Design a protein around this ligand. Structure first.
Ligand SMILES: O=C(O)c1cc(-c2ccc(OCc3ccccc3)cc2)nc2c1cnn2Cc1ccncc1
Ligand SMILES: [Ca+2]
Ligand SMILES: [Ca+2]
Ligand SMILES: [Ca+2]
Ligand SMILES: [Ca+2]
Length: 433
């Protein structure tokens, strides 16, 4: 009955973030609840041939939540989920939020080695995966867990075998009996994000802090009920989930449109079919798109905004976005640990093409420091340190590492090398180990 442990913000900071209206002390399910109230029949998710309305998304995740609760999974428990880019990812995410189960969403590209490390760290009582994934092709991996007393009490499979619990069965049919359930408290852990060498580290995220980042990002990117966002990056990634990502689009009442990956021809036909107007990519994928865009100009005309974040995205490449992809560019530099930066939609061309923008919050605090951790002269290159209303205060159960990446004032040192431009934005220039 003990809630998952995590490092808290100081009480003084928590109060300030409430006073400012950042933390409103609602669960992440707020997004769905409110949507169902306002526009139950608007499309929330488009996936292949399927069209899920807000109320359907709400019903289905409720069904699964009741099933999990009926089996005694709830507050204090954790879950490991590994699903590809399909509507079930969101159904499951909202079900676990509803049920009070703290969930770690593994990347679909993760393998037995990562999965094992995650299971060891969070002792999930629930595992959801897909039979089509390499790790669950056979029962080797699953059986291995019994050999080590880490077997989950419940295992659900997408593309299940006859003797499996079918994920779709637990979604489609509500439970026999009724057991009470509810989200974890808003200033407590909702789910684990993952850092992006060694296995990824677990980043506890509370409803308060995640919802804030989501609502504020949605406003910054001008999302609204007509937004149709392509989800071609991995759904669990902070960028694709919250920046502003699927949660942002749902917050704004719009629709998420799934793609398996950023392969251009498939993405282009999806964009044409559903008149997608927003997408989010990393530079290597922007380059793939640029290679075909001229020829498939007609298919992607509806794009109005493309976010680009990740690796190097030099100016000469950035300028090709409006020129070739025929949509506005927004640069994004963020981290699953918290801090996200966006170029604003009304920024100058220079800002948009040569910087990675500025923080979500007026209360995102930034230090740029030299080798002695003294703030460098304004405009010079330095190591990034940050804290704010949606930046974490430590990795899960990692006191040693935490002490090595936070300073006495609880600034987080992300290892990024950056400089502030005169205009006020940030330029990412490298990384330090
Ligand atoms: O500094 C970075 O290394 C970085 C990587 C990625 C990123 C990398 C891979 C992703 O998915 C990996 C993938 C790419 C192409 C096809 C299939 C999978 C998603 C985001 N996104 C980044 C980075 C820096 N800002 N952003 C945007 C961002 C926004 C919010 N939270 C975290 C990151
Ligand atoms: Ca439907
Ligand atoms: Ca366009
Ligand atoms: Ca053009
Ligand atoms: Ca980093």
């Amino acid at each position: 009955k003990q809630l998952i442990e995590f490092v808290r913000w100081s009480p003084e900071r928590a109060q300030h973030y409430r006073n400012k209206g950042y933390w409103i002390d609602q669960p992440l399910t707020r997004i769905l609840t409110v949507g169902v109230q306002s526009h139950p029949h608007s499309l929330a998710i488009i996936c292949g041939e399927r069209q899920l309305s807000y109320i359907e998304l709400d019903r289905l995740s409720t069904n699964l939540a009741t099933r999990l609760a009926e089996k005694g999974l709830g507050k204090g428990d954790t879950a490991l989920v590994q699903l590809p880019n399909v509507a079930e990812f969101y159904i499951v995410f909202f079900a676990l939020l509803k049920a009070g189960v703290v969930v770690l969403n593994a990347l679909y590209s993760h393998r037995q080695y990562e999965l094992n490390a995650f299971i060891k760290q969070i002792q999930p009582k629930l595992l959801i995966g897909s039979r089509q994934h390499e790790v669950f092709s056979n029962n080797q991996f699953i059986d291995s867990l019994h050999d080590v007393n880490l077997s989950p009490e419940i295992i659900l499979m997408l593309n299940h075998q006859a003797t499996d619990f079918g994920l779709l069965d637990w979604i489609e049919t509500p439970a026999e009996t009724f057991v009470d359930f509810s989200s974890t408290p808003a200033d407590e852990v909702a789910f684990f994000q993952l850092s992006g060498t060694g296995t990824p580290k677990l980043i506890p995220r509370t409803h308060n802090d995640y919802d804030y980042s989501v609502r504020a990002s949605a406003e910054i990117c001008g999302l609204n009920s007509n937004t149709r966002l392509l989800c071609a990056l991995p759904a669990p990634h902070n960028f694709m989930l919250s920046s502003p990502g699927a949660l942002g689009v749902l917050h704004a009442g719009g629709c998420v449109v799934m793609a398996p990956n950023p392969e251009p021809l498939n993405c282009f036909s999806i964009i044409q079919r559903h008149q997608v107007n927003m997408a989010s990519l990393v530079p290597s994928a922007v380059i793939m798109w640029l290679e075909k865009a001229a020829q498939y100009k007609d298919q992607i005309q509806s794009l109005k905004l493309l976010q680009v974040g990740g690796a190097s995205f030099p100016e000469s490449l950035a300028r090709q976005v409006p020129e070739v992809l025929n949509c506005k560019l927004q640069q994004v530099f963020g981290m699953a640990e918290g801090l996200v930066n966006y170029t604003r939609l009304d920024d100058s061309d220079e800002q948009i093409f040569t910087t990675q923008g500025r923080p979500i919050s007026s209360d995102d605090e930034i230090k740029i420091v030299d080798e002695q951790y003294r703030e460098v002269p304004e405009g010079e290159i330095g190591m990034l340190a940050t804290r704010g209303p949606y930046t974490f205060c430590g990795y899960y159960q990692s006191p040693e590492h935490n002490s090595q990446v936070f300073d006495e004032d609880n600034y987080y040192y992300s290892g990024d090398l950056v400089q502030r431009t005169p205009d006020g934005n940030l330029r990412v220039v490298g990384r330090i180990k």
